[PDB]
């Protein structure tokens, strides 16, 4: 009644591998450490692909939640009890 | 009781290199209670040994004495507690919102029927209940929990023998108990009332006793 | 998968996918004193993760005391593993591997078996009883095994319903329990980072009977869910200690506003709980629906008709919900297998963390070499085949995968103990039903089938054709020593092989069971106490071997020692009459034997550290301090061998040729002992002259070893030999009135009372006393019968003490069936033990 | 809001602000209209399909959605 | 002491309306099994039947 | 209800902060708010021209913050 299911699913994703696509077209794939009720994601070991396609490595990343377009979650979360 | 089954006897086992009484250190005799408490250690050939219920945590219940004391009160029977932390600073800006108080703040801690309501937790059955099914008058033994206690020291020998004899039949009943057989409900008195030979009324018990006496005569 | 299983709140696919992520797994063992609530917790959690499996209204479904004797005795006997997926306060889910351990002091071996494969400990403490004997013993054992320690103060309802303490005094009782635990931890550990306090989330408060379990954070979250605008994490930091709430300023201060102001814990946590319980148990008809309305709980009509205890359980379950505080505790303060792998390898792996295989194991990488350690063996109800149980520290085990099983004697040079076996099936162990799986990655607990044949107690399962330099994990180091000894013999001698097979099976089951065959063809079982041996024999007669077995009288194991220095310097020569050794025996300094056994000193140290230790600790000169050759029958035996041979008198280079043999002779001699074939304890052996034959064809091998053993025996026999009893430490809880009765019971069995003291906040007393182990059979029954069941005692082995008499004195005449006076107890203990062993009737004191 | 609990589990294509098309199984939604789509594929324009999986998109970039396939078995 | 040793040695080597007293048990030698400590119940619980004032 | 974003692990930490209009900013964090508006000590501009320009005490609106990276190890 207060906090939506997708935010709960994102909470479940902590500790797995996640790929993050911000409005600047930058793709961040790495281990999601923490997440809040907002999409503020603290995520680590980033393989980052820019718009041109350049790939870099960046060990610590904190993304503002307002600036996420979409988040791709691991498929085992499809079996989360919260997705039933 | 009497021997359950005829078997070997304490005078029937010959001396062996096992059970030789010259190899045995005696400090305290192996009483029968020791053999009941650990039936598989202090005993040879244990059969039909029902393992006894081990210790139950001691119920430290402080029975109240005066109803003019608080229900939650440090009774003198309770041994005193001898007096003697990353807490945040007072200046830390944490404030509890205006409309936040402990959950039950208007509800009094204890009512006038709180001490009595706790004492009902440890009452013997059926006084620990608040609902149940009625029993027949003859199915309620009022002294069954009297002779299940220890034999009272100092009473004459007849009283103690009576205690033990009552316990014997109690144990036999509990042991020889058989499941009630499945059947089809057939009631004699309903059958009697169905026929035209019987009729119903409502009489004093003494009058019916006199009628039954005369009828039997 | 594909197994019919009880329906869960989660789904087993999620459980299987959690096992791969080693950061969401928590390997936890539940331990505590006897009957301190460790088992409801498991069902108190199984129920919350199993909608259909509920506890009976009038009877608690133990669900982990799955055994027969466990169900009748109501005493935890064997560890039962439980693997459940538990949600967190924040809604996240973790996979929990929980080890439910028995709380009886006799079954500590099961606790050590659980501790080996666990990364953290949840210590359960009764709120009314407090810190009892086994709580201290398990704290010591857990902080010694380098495990994260957390505390769950169970049975807090006893403070409310039984003792009826005022909320402030309940707070004092809880703070006192926490302080006692903190003091014990600081006593047994040097580093400070194991401070236990509910402010840090280390301590939880619970009442498993009534489905109550909360930390400070979880209760603050209840507040936040009711009143949205509060931040529960910062709220929780003000809910303990001498911090008071000021309702006028709406701020928490360290000073009480005016007077009659209650601490934050009382005002916000203890008082609401007191009021809930009081309303339910006193005003269920009058004013319960209104308070239930206030808390937001709505109970249906047939639900309000329940008896008081089920109604209280239901109300508290509605109010609190799931056990999120416990999961918060175990997630924040118990390392994941990935993080906790390094201390585990550092402590329990023989190769050390520095080893190449040690590194791959410390990574806890599930694509590395297989390294599975098994510590428990569970027998199927048929009693024929066993299933090994242990955690996969590295690699990944598969069903049907051939494996190489290493025993306890397997070394990198003696590779004969290893044996190839084929894994049959793998079960994710839950308390009652096994969930069969196809593979188990690193960091998880697995029940293995097919590797039970070549293992006795523990094993290390690796991969064949790889992992050539794979050593083993250290065998379990137990808390106690098996002392109580009984002999077994089949009624019909024809079926002896059946009893031998049953003995092997029980040796597999009980981790600390020691079954040996004495020289006289007598089969002997060593146990910790009466209940331990009772259940061992119950299993032996009924489960594994279906034959009838006779049981001898219980007896203890003795030890042999000296009390002065040897009168005449003994000597013994080889049959070649060329090599001659001269030795003397003297008693060790007070408190040195305990230092040796407890690994305070090790012969693996360089001679410099050994010498400096002995110099600074026991007034040894450098010559003798560096002169140590061996350390008793084992590497840590309570005896010492010292060479006093002068460099001028004997050439030290030639003495080095026979050092390696004199050490073995002394070790074997101390292993056997001359008096009654018992261990020698607290004896210092000094070599005075070792004449060595120059020709190596005369010395070495089977010529010098027996000479060394004989000279050890003879040197021991000159200095007055004495026997040693094992002494038990008994803690008794009893009311004030029965304390005198406890004294009376103890006085009859050579008991010596050390201290009696009240239990703070409880109407009972604790009597701590010392009793000889042999004068202890039936002591528990005597105490519980003389006191009409109101006094209960747990006994545990403490130390070794000298029997009053002198074993070598033929003047004493002993009758066959009478208790002996103390002045000559040692003579009886010596000759009767000799007769039991089958030796001669008396020793032959000579040179 | 029953107008979208009716659409759950249905294979849904959602139009993005940048013109991106996301076809997948509608699982969950919230007040901010963040969508949970499982076994989701993205269609971009040159025709090409990139299989992604479980996508949690923020409500910011979501524009328009439409049922494309019946719920699977 | 003497009964102690005797017990050790033993172990290791008509319409009768009233019960015969020979059937009695609890004729024991150990003083702990004769003079049993009586439960006091914190001085607040009492045994059923017997007069309270006693 | 506006919970403060978790940047305490990034406290006192040298950080690189990219912007809306392809801008990028470097410095060490000194505090935040529930709107994550971010204060930077020893701030360095280093615009896309390639030249690093240092300012010092600066405070940024969180609405233009794209992504926060801790250059130094946290
Ligand atoms: N008053 C009270 N009694 C409880 C509570 N939890 C359990 N008990 C009871 O206390 C006893 C403890 O039994 P268990 O919980 O099975 O014991 P354990 O802690 O597993 O310990 P072991 O017997 O060594 O296995 C039982 O009678 C329980 O029903 C509680 O919260 N309050």
- Asked if C227 reaches chain F (Cβ–Cβ under 8 Å), the answer is no
Query: How far apart, in whole angstroms, are the C-alpha atoms of residue C684 and residue C688?
Result: 13
* Contacts of C824-832 spanning 24+ positions with Cβ under 8 A: C826/C722, C826/C723, C828/B25, C829/B25, C829/C558, C829/C676, C829/C723, C829/C725, C829/C774, C829/C803, C829/C805, C830/C675, C830/C676, C830/C723, C832/B22, C832/B23, C832/B24, C832/B25
Q: Compute the distance between CA of residue B186 and CA of residue C548 in angstroms, rounded to an integer.
A: 50
Interface test mutation site (partner E, options C164, C740, C741, C777, max chain E beta carbons within 10 A) = C741
How many other β-carbons are positioned within 10 Å of the β-carbon of residue E9? 13
> Do residues C826 and C804 lie in contact, with contact meaning Cβ atoms separated by under 8 Å?
yes
D30, D32, D55: residue with CB nearest A72: D55
Sole residue written with tokens 């409310």:
C160
Are residues D43 and D60 in contact, defined by beta-carbon separation less than 8 angstroms?
A: no
The conformation of residue C748, written as its DSSP 8-state character, comes to: T
Distance C199 CA to ligand 1 centre (A): 26
Is the CB of residue C555 less than 8 Å from the CB of residue C774? yes
Domain ranges of chain A: 3-84
A36 contacts chain D (CB < 8 A): no
Q: Cα of C75 to ligand 1 centre, how many Å?
A: 10
Question: CA angle C153-C158-C160, nearest 5°?
Answer: 110
Q: Which of A2, A12, A84 sits opposite C92 (nearest CB)?
A: A12
CA C521 distance to own-chain centroid = 32
Nearest to C46 by CA among C81, C72, C14: C81
Q: Please, which residues have CB within 8 angstroms of residue C721's CB and are 6 or more apart in sequence? A: C560, C561, C562, C674, C675, C807, C808
Contacts of C403 (CB under 8 A, 6+ apart): C370, C397, C420, C421, C422, C423, C451, C461, C462, C463, C464
How many CA within 13 A on the CB side of residue C508? 27
Q: Are C468 and C49 in contact (CB under 8 A)?
A: no
* Pick from E8, B44, B20: nearest CA to C551: B44
The candidate with the shortest Cα–Cα distance to C95, out of C440, C408, C388, C357, is C440
C802 marked among binding-site residues: no
> What are the start-end ranges of the E strands in A16-65?
17-22, 27-35, 41-49, 55-63
Roughly what angle, to the nearest 10 degrees, separates helices C308-320 and C216-226? 80
Q: Which residues contact C522 (CB under 8 A, 6 or more apart)?
A: B18, C487, C489, C836, C837, C838
Q: Where are the alpha helices (DSSP H) in C352-486?
A: 356-363
Half-sphere exposure of A36 toward its Cβ, with a 13 Å CA cutoff?
Answer: 19
Work out whether the CA dihedral C282, C285, C290, C295 comes out positive or negative: positive
Two structure tokens written together for C548? 């009838």
What lies within 8 Å, CB to CB, of B140 at 6+ separation is none
CA of C36 to the centre of ligand 1 (A): 5
Return the domain boundaries, chain D.
1-72
- Say if F and E touch: at least 3 Cβ pairs within 8 Å: no
Residue nearest to atom 9 of ligand 1 (CA): C37
Spell out which residues of chain F touch residue C228, defining contact as CB-CB under 8 Å: 1
Residues 6+ apart with CB under 8 A from C475: C408, C457, C458
Is residue C155 a known part of a binding site? yes
C454 and C399 Cβ atoms separated by less than 8 Å: no
| Rounded alpha-carbon distances, angstroms, from residue C351 to A32, C24, C348, C472 | 35, 28, 9, 8
- Give me C730's structure tokens: 């008994």
**Chains E vs A: touching, with 3+ CB pairs under 8 Å?**
no
Show the tokens assigned to E11.
């172990």
Residue C130 CA to ligand 1 center (angstroms) comes to 14
H runs (alpha helix) in chain B: 32-37, 115-119, 157-175, 188-194, 205-216
Distance of CA C60 from the midpoint of ligand 1 (Å): 9
Which of B53, B55, B64 to substitute to test the interface with C, most C CBs within 10 Å? B55
Pairing mode of beta strands C148-154, C120-126: parallel
Q: How many Å from the N-terminal Cα to the C-terminal Cα in chain C?
A: 72
Write the residue with the smallest CA distance to atom 5 of ligand 1.
C209
First to last CA, chain A: 17
Antiparallel, parallel or unpaired: β C570-573 and C203-207 = unpaired
Structural resolution in Å: 3.1
- Integer-rounded Cα Rg, in Å, for chain C is 30
| Cα torsion through C327, C332, C337, C343, rounded to 10 | -140
The residue whose CB lies within 8 Å of the most ligand 1 atoms, and thus the one to mutate among C29, C34, C39, C104, is C39
Residue-wise DSSP of C345-380: HHHHBTT-TTSHHHHHHHHT-TTS--EEEEEEEEE-
Q: Which residues pair with C628 in a beta bridge?
A: C642
CB atoms within 10 A of CB F63: 12
Domain A3-84 has CATH 3.40.50.300: no
User: What structural domains and CATH numbers belong to chain F?
Assistant: 8-70 (2.30.30.100)
Which residue of chain B comes nearest to E8, CA vs CA? B29
The sign of the torsion formed by the CA atoms of C722, C724, C725, C731 equals positive
Q: Which chains touch C (3 or more CB pairs under 8 A)?
A: A, B, E, F
* Beta pairing, strands C679-680 & C559-562: parallel
Residues in chain E: 54
Could you tell me which residues come within 8 angstroms of residue C486 by beta carbon, excluding any fewer than 6 positions away?
Answer: B41, C524, C525, C527, C533, C537, C551, C552, C553, C554, C555
- The answer to whether residues C842 and C835 touch, using CB atoms and an 8 Å cutoff, is no
Provide the CA A68 distance to its chain's centre, in angstroms: 8
- This entry's atomic model was obtained through cryo-EM
**How far is the C-alpha of C326 from the C-alpha of C318, rounded, in Å?**
17
Ligand 1 atom nearest the C-alpha of C128 is: 1
* Distance in Å, CA C180 to ligand 1 centroid: 22
A34 with F18: Cβ contact below 8 A: no
Element at C172 (helix H, strand E): helix C167-188
Cβ neighbours around A83 below 10 Å, total: 19
Which distant-in-sequence residues (6+ apart) come within 8 Å of C497 by Cβ? Answer: none
- Does the beta carbon of C207 lie inside 6 Å of ligand 1? yes
Q: Count the alpha carbons within 13 Å of B206 in the hemisphere toward its beta carbon.
A: 0
- Listed by number, the residues of chain F in 2-21 with a beta carbon closer than 8 Å to a beta carbon of chain C are 3
Locus of tokens 């004391």: B69
Determine whether the shortest distance from the Cβ of C154 to ligand 1 is under 6 A.
yes
Q: What DSSP letter does each residue of F45-66 carry, written as one string?
A: ---TTS---B--SEEE-GGG--
Of C97, C32, C43, C95, whose CA–CA distance to C65 is shortest?
C43
Return left, alpha or beta for C599; rule: phi > 0 is left, psi -120 to 50 is alpha, else beta. left
User: Which chain B residues are closer than 8 Å to E35 by Cβ?
Assistant: 153
CA distance C639 to C616: 19
CA atoms of D42 and D16, how far apart (whole Å): 10
Q: Are C535 and C77 in contact, with CB atoms under 8 Å apart?
A: yes
Residues of A in Cβ contact (< 8 Å) with F66: 22-24, 63-64, 67
Option in A69, A71, A83 nearest D27 (CB): A83
**Residue indicated by tokens 């498929």:** A75
Instruction: Select from A18, A36, A80 the residue whose CB has the most chain C CBs within 10 Å, as the one to mutate to test that interface.
Output: A80
- C-alpha pair distances (Å), B137 with each of B140, B141, B142, C338, C603: 6, 9, 10, 67, 80
Report the distance separating Cα C643 and Cα C662, nearest Å.
10
Strands (E), C14-102: 25-32, 80-87, 93-100
Q: Which residues pair with C460 in a beta bridge?
A: C373, C406
Tell whether C502 is in a known binding site. no
- Give residue C37 CA to ligand 1 midpoint distance, Å: 4
C74 a known binding residue?
no
Atom of ligand 1 at shortest distance to CA of C62?
A: 16
B121 touches chain C (CB under 8 A): yes
Contact indicator for A70, D55 with CB cutoff of 8 Å: yes
- Rounded Cα distance between C53 and B204, Å, is 54
Residues 24-53 in E contacting B (C-alpha not used; CB under 8 Å): 24-26, 30, 33-36, 41-42, 44-45, 47-49
Distance CA F20, CA F65 (A): 7
Longest dimension (CA), chain C: 102
Question: What is the three-class DSSP state of E26?
Answer: coil
Quote the Cα angle for D70-D71-D73, to 5°.
Answer: 125
Residues paired with C212 in a beta bridge: C207
**Which residues neighbour C145 within 8 Å (Cβ) at sequence distance 6 or greater?**
C112, C115, C116, C347
- CB contact under 8 Å between C228 and F3, yes or no, is no
Which chain F residues are within 8 Å of A14, Cβ to Cβ?
none
Q: Are strands C212-214 and C203-207 parallel, antiparallel or unpaired?
A: antiparallel
Within a 13 Å sphere around the CA of C413, how many CA atoms are in the beta-carbon half? 0
Q: Is C436 exposed, middle or buried (0-12, 13-18, 19+ CB in 10 A)?
A: middle
């Amino acid at each position: 009644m207060s906090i939506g299911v997708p935010i709960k699913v994102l909470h479940e994703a902590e500790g797995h591998i996640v790929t993050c696509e911000t409005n600047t077209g930058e793709v961040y794939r790495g281990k999601l450490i923490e997440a809040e009720d907002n999409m503020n994601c603290q995520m680590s070991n980033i393989t980052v692909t820019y718009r041109d396609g350049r790939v870099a490595q960046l060990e610590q990343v904190y993304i503002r939640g307002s600036k996420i377009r979409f988040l791709i979650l691991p498929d085992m979360l499809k079996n989360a009890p919260m997705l039933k | 009781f009497e021997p359950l089954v005829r078997d070997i006897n304490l005078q029937d086992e010959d001396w062996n290199e096992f059970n030789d009484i010259n190899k045995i250190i005696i400090r305290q005799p192996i009483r029968t209670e020791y053999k009941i408490a650990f039936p598989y250690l202090y005993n040879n050939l244990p059969h039909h040994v029902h393992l006894t219920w081990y210790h139950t945590p001691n119920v430290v219940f402080i029975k109240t004495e005066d109803p003019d004391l608080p229900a939650f009160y440090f009774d003198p029977l309770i041994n005193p507690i001898s007096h003697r932390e990353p807490l945040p600073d007072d200046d830390e800006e944490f404030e509890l919102p205006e409309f936040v108080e402990p959950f039950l703040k208007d509800t009094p801690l204890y009512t006038d029927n709180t001490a009595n309501g706790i004492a009902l937790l440890w009452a013997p059955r059926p006084f620990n209940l608040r609902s149940g099914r009625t029993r027949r008058a003859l199915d309620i033994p009022l002294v069954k929990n009297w002779y299940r206690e220890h034999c009272p020291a100092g009473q004459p020998v007849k009283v103690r023998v009576s205690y033990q004899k009552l316990l014997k039949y109690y144990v036999l009943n509990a042991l020889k108990h058989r499941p009630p057989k499945a059947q089809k409900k057939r009631y004699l008195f309903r059958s009697f009332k169905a026929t035209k030979f019987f009729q119903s009324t409502k009489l004093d018990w003494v009058e019916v006793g006199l009628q039954v006496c005369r009828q039997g005569y | 998968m594909e197994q019919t299983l009880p329906v869960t709140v989660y789904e087993m696919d999620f459980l299987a996918d959690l096992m791969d992520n080693s950061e969401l797994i928590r390997n936890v063992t539940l331990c505590g004193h006897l009957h301190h609530g460790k088992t409801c917790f498991v069902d108190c959690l199984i129920e919350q993760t199993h909608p259909e499996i509920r506890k009976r209204y009038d009877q608690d479904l133990c669900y982990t005391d799955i055994l027969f004797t466990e169900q009748e005795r109501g005493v935890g006997i064997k560890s039962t593993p439980v693997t459940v997926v538990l949600p967190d306060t924040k809604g996240k889910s973790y996979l929990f591997n929980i080890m439910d351990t028995p709380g009886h002091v006799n079954f500590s071996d099961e606790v050590t078996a659980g501790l080996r494969i666990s990364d953290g400990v949840v210590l359960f403490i009764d709120a009314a009883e407090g810190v009892m004997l086994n709580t201290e013993r398990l704290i010591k054992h857990a902080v010694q095994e380098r495990l994260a320690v957390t505390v769950c103060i169970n049975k807090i309802d006893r403070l409310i319903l039984e003792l009826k303490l005022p909320p402030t005094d309940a707070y004092y009782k809880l703070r006192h329990i926490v302080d006692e635990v903190n003091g014990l931890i600081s006593m047994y550990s040097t580093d400070e980072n194991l401070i236990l306090s509910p402010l840090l989330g280390n301590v939880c408060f619970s009442s498993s009977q009534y489905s109550i379990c909360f930390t400070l954070g979880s209760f603050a979250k209840i507040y936040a869910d009711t009143f949205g605008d509060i931040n529960y994490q910062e709220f929780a930091k003000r809910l303990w200690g001498d911090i008071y709430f000021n309702p006028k300023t709406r701020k928490f201060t360290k000073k009480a506003p005016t007077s009659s102001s209650q601490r934050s814990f009382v005002e916000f946590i203890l008082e609401p709980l007191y009021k809930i319980l009081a309303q339910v148990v006193g005003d269920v008809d009058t004013s319960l629906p209104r308070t239930l309305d206030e808390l937001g709980i709505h109970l249906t009509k047939e639900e309000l008709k329940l008896n008081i205890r089920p109604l209280l359980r239901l109300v508290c379950k509605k109010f609190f919900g799931e056990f999120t505080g416990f999961v918060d505790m175990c997630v924040q303060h118990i390392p994941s297998p990935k993080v906790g792998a390094k201390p585990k390898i550092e402590h329990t792996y023989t190769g050390g963390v520095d080893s190449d295989l040690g590194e791959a194991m410390s990574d806890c990488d599930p694509d590395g070499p297989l390294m599975c350690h098994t510590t428990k063996m569970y027998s199927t109800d048929d009693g024929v085949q066993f299933h090994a149980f242990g955690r996969v520290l590295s690699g990944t085990i598969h069903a049907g995968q051939p494996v190489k099983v290493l025993g306890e004697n397997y070394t990198l040079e003696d590779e004969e103990d290893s044996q190839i076996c084929t894994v049959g099936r793998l079960w994710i162990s839950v308390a009652r039903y096994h969930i069969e799986v196809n593979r188990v990655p690193a960091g998880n607990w697995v029940l293995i089938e097919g590797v039970d044949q070549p293992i006795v107690k523990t094993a290390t399962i690796t991969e064949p054709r790889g992992n050539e330099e794979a050593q083993i994990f250290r065998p379990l180091k137990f808390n106690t020593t098996s002392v109580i000894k009984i002999a077994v013999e089949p009624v019909n001698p024809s079926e002896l092989p059946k009893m031998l097979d049953g003995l092997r099976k029980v040796n597999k089951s009980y981790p600390s069971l020691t079954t040996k065959v004495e020289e006289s063809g007598e089969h002997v079982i060593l146990g910790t106490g009466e209940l331990y041996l009772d259940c061992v024999m119950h299993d032996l007669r009924k489960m594994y071997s279906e034959i009838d077995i006779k049981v001898a009288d219980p007896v203890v194991t003795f030890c042999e020692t000296v009390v002065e220095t040897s009168s005449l310097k003994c000597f013994a020569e080889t049959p070649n009459k060329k090599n001659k050794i001269t030795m003397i025996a003297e008693p060790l300094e007070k408190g040195l034997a305990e230092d040796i056994e407890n690994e305070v000193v090790q012969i693996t140290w360089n001679r410099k550290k050994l010498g400096e230790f002995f110099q600074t600790k026991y007034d040894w000169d450098l010559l003798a301090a560096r002169s140590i050759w061996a350390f008793g029958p084992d590497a840590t035996g309570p005896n010492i061998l010292v060479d006093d041979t002068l460099p001028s008198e004997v050439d030290k280079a030639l003495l080095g040729s026979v050092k390696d043999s004199i050490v073995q002779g002394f070790q074997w001699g101390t292993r056997e002992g001359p008096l009654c074939d018992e261990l020698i304890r607290n004896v210092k052996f000094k070599i005075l002259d070792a004449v060595v034959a120059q020709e190596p064809l005369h010395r070495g091998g089977g010529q010098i070893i027996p000479t060394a053993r004989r000279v050890v025996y003879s040197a021991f026999l000159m200095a007055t030999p004495r026997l040693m009893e094992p002494y038990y430490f008994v803690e008794v809880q009893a009311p004030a009135d029965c304390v005198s009765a406890v004294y009376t019971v103890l006085a009859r069995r050579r008991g010596h009372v050390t201290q009696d003291a009240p239990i703070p906040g409880s109407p009972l007393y604790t009597i701590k006393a010392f009793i000889p182990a042999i004068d202890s059979f039936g002591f528990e029954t005597d105490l519980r019968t003389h006191t009409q069941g109101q006094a209960f005692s747990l006994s545990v082995f403490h130390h070794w003490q000298i029997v009053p008499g002198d074993p070598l004195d033929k003047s004493i005449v002993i009758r066959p069936l009478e208790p002996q006076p103390a002045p000559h107890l040692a003579r009886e203990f010596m000759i009767k033990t000799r007769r039991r062993k089958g030796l001669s009737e008396d020793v032959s004191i000579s040179k | 809001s029953s107008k979208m609990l009716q659409h759950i589990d249905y294979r849904m294509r959602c139009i993005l602000q940048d013109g991106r098309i996301f076809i997948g199984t509608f699982k969950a939604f919230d007040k901010h209209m963040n969508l949970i789509l499982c076994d989701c594929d993205e269609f971009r324009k040159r025709e090409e399909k990139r299989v992604l999986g479980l996508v949690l998109l923020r409500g910011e970039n979501l524009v328009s959605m439409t049922v494309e396939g019946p719920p699977p078995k | 002491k003497s009964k102690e040793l005797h017990a050790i040695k033993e172990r290791y080597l008509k319409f009768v309306f009233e019960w015969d007293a020979s059937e009695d048990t609890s004729i024991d030698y150990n003083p702990l099994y004769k003079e049993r400590h009586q439960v006091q119940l914190l001085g607040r619980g009492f045994i059923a039947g017997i007069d309270l004032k006693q | 209800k506006a919970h403060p974003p978790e940047l305490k692990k990034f406290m006192d930490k040298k950080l690189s902060l990219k912007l809306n209009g392809g801008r990028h900013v470097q410095g060490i964090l000194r505090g935040f708010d529930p709107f994550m508006n971010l204060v930077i000590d020893e701030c360095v501009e280093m615009a896309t021209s390639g030249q690093q320009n240092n300012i010092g005490m600066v405070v940024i609106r969180g609405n233009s913050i794209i992504m926060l990276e801790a250059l130094e190890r946290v």
